[PDB]
């Protein structure tokens, strides 16, 4: 689901 991509991106870009 394309609509889930930015959540993944947000999660991996946290520190």
């Amino acid at each position, epitope marked *: *689901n*394309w*609509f889930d*991509i*930015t*959540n993944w*991106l*947000w999660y991996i870009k*946290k520190k």
Partner: antibody
Amino acid sequence: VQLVQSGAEVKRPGSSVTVSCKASGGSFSTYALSWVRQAPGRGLEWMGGVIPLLTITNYAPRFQGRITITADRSTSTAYLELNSLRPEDTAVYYCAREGTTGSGGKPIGAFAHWGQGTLVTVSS
Amino acid sequence: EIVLTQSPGTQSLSPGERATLSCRASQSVGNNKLAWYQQRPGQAPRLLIYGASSRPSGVADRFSGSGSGTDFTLTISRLEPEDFAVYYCQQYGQSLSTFGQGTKVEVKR
């Protein structure tokens, strides 16, 4: 987050239209920006969207072959191009960006932020 | 393509009354990614509910969403004058997002 679209335009049948959507506030590159249209007296129709950082587009099958959605990170502007215009394409075109939840910027997918719309009239 | 059915397409109700609006999907909606929007004439749509039941901070708590799978409902606990408007559901549980055709909540007299 405020989305500001380019102004109304009249386009001839068979031509191509480009509509712009400039975002101010928050981050541009990591949130999904979609285009949704509404023909006169009709409902909302999702056309497609882009995730700028990744350059990943996602088009509705109905528009796949006629649409291009692009993002310019230097100006926080997204663009909709729609080709081969027909009178049925007369509509208000909205850009719509996904919302966030909490304080950490977590995206929600659903469209919290909407531009003012752009009326594209296809006519001779 | 998931078809979202909003039936009835119009509800005639009085101010102060409760409203329940149905959105039925032709297939199960992935992870209950179902949103509701309000739209008044001449205005852009506005997000009321996302993820079937979550409500953004700014949105009046008289709006609530419920349901899962193929069977979703927007509830307006008590209709205020500004609530008479059109309501759209939208699924985004797969890459092809779709909207319902809308339900107009209008004033019965």
